[PDB]
Amino acid sequence: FSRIVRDVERLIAVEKYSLQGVVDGDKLLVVGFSEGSVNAYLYDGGETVKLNREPINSVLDPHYGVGRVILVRDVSKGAEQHALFKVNTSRPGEEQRLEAVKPMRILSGVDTGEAVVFTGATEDRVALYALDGGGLRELARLPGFGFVSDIRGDLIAGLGFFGGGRVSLFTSNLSSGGLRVFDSGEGSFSSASISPGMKVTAGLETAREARLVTVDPRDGSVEDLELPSKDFSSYRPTAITWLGYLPDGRLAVVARREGRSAVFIDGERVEAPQGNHGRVVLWRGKLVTSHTSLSTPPRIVSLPSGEPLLEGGLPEDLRRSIAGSRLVWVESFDGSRVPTYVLESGRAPTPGPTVVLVHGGPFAEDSDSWDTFAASLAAAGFHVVMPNYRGSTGYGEEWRLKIIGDPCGGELEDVSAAARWARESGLASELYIMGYSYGGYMTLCALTMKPGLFKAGVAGASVVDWEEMYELSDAAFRNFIEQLTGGSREIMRSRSPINHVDRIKEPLALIHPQNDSRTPLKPLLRLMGELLARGKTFEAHIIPDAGHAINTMEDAVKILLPAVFFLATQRER
Numbered sequence: 001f002s003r004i005v006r007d008v009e010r011l012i013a014v015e016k017y018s019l020q021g022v023v024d025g026d027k028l029l030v031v032g033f034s035e036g037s038v039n040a041y042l043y044d045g046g047e048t049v050k051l052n053r054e055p056i057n058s059v060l061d062p063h064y065g066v067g068r069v070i071l072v073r074d075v076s077k078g079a080e081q082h083a084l085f086k087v088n089t090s091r092p093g094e095e096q097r098l099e100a101v102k103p104m105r106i107l108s109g110v111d112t113g114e115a116v117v118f119t120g121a122t123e124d125r126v127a128l129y130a131l132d133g134g135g136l137r138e139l140a141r142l143p144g145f146g147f148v149s150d151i152r153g154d155l156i157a158g159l160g161f162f163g164g165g166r167v168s169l170f171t172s173n174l175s176s177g178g179l180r181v182f183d184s185g186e187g188s189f190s191s192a193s194i195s196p197g198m199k200v201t202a203g204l205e206t207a208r209e210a211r212l213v214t215v216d217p218r219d220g221s222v223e224d225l226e227l228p229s230k231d232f233s234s235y236r237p238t239a240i241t242w243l244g245y246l247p248d249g250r251l252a253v254v255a256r257r258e259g260r261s262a263v264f265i266d267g268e269r270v271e272a273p274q275g276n277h278g279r280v281v282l283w284r285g286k287l288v289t290s291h292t293s294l295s296t297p298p299r300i301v302s303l304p305s306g307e308p309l310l311e312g313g314l315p316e317d318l319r320r321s322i323a324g325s326r327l328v329w330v331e332s333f334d335g336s337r338v339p340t341y342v343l344e345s346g347r348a349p350t351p352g353p354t355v356v357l358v359h360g361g362p363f364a365e366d367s368d369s370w371d372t373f374a375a376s377l378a379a380a381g382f383h384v385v386m387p388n389y390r391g392s393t394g395y396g397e398e399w400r401l402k403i404i405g406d407p408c409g410g411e412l413e414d415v416s417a418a419a420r421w422a423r424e425s426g427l428a429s430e431l432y433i434m435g436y437s438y439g440g441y442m443t444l445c446a447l448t449m450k451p452g453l454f455k456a457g458v459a460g461a462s463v464v465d466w467e468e469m470y471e472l473s474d475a476a477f478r479n480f481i482e483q484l485t486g487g488s489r490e491i492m493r494s495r496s497p498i499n500h501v502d503r504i505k506e507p508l509a510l511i512h513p514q515n516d517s518r519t520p521l522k523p524l525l526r527l528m529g530e531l532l533a534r535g536k537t538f539e540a541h542i543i544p545d546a547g548h549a550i551n552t553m554e555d556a557v558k559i560l561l562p563a564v565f566f567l568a569t570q571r572e573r
Ligand SMILES: O=[N+]([O-])c1ccc(OP(=O)(O)O)cc1
Pocket: 360, 361, 362, 436, 437, 438, 463, 469, 473, 477, 478, 480, 481, 484, 518, 519
């Protein structure tokens, strides 16, 4: 029913912005989705300025005012074999490939103006690199996913998922390399930034709260940072999205709890629109950050006014399809409380058609943040339930690590409960499961382990077999999988939908990017083979020249359109 396409394509098309830093003297560096693809722009108060030629994937963090931007573009048609390109800001649209770096999964990076420090992954290692005038140097080989946080002088700070789901903090030297890894018996570090005193300020997420610590690298000492203003310290945040020093020394922090964040400057809370904020930068004296919300696509506003600098306005009608939204606390199987964001659709009755949309990750969370899938779903006439199952971020360390070694176990029990809640609360008249990635893994775990729960399910870029996916993984994922599963082949086998297909009883729609190197297509072709033989009902959509990263309005459409079509079809019985 085309009345569906009109809105879904519109929600997809709305320009989306993310903030990166201040470059070229004093212009904001931003990444926005606009024109039908992901590009990098300079903004200076008026018209925006495209920096790259063809679509990119992202930009490396630039120090304040540097005169160049390092683009990160996939040169593998989706497989995510990134190549790094340099662009001088005075000469927009001219790129010089950094041929010193061979294509790899570029995980993160910063550009000091003189040196380029990033972390990449290959079939054999995740490493911390540095590319300056003398060429490429590997500063350290890392255990698993590691991301660069900040560079001040020779001191490099980063975050690393080096074991058991915990995030550790590491330091290295830009000229002499090396690696130090600081662990915190109390939890995981969520952000880092180097202080003028050359100590590492970091967010620390413990079982309960999230606190500000100072970590002296010279040894490893940790102590609570004391801020000038006490506002911050009296809010008790659950997580710290990002923190960092502005040019003038003031400490900027973005803390969050229950799905919404606040921004503090030296401990003094600055007013910011409700929702969630990205990094904070000092621009011409003023404070800029990125704002988002279930009803507001990622935009860039001024603080404290909230006035928008760059923003893809969301239309009135489409804005009107989200009748409301709540944060609920679904009662799980073990007595656990699953924070769940719900979205009543203005186009469905109550009770009515509901979709338990499962977030990916698993270390992610459903928060007060723009979500294209849930929005279009509301648009198509379905209420949306988004449960922060155990393994989610944003609710403490204890809740986040409960998934380690237990995939397709407890979190799945939390997803089922969200359904149980949707039905018993009066919101649902019928139930569907839909998700991309770990979310799509969950659809597959729900349909197999728990037939009868949902009327049908949509699994996009889904996990299908830990064993095979493993042997097809680069150093970052293989390690990441070794962490989720605990490494036991009993878990990898027993917690793989591919092995319990006989149990399926509902209609399945498989959507998968042909070149996805995060969740490979190969196992999904075996699944389809299994579905066929067992005489199971299913439809599938494999997408051309695309990977896990959806960075063009055509791939987003090819991925969301089939989904909404599938569900609208099941809804009419
Ligand atoms: O291999 N893995 O363990 C694995 C691969 C892809 C995943 O999905 P993502 O979280 O959305 O990047 C999650 C886990």
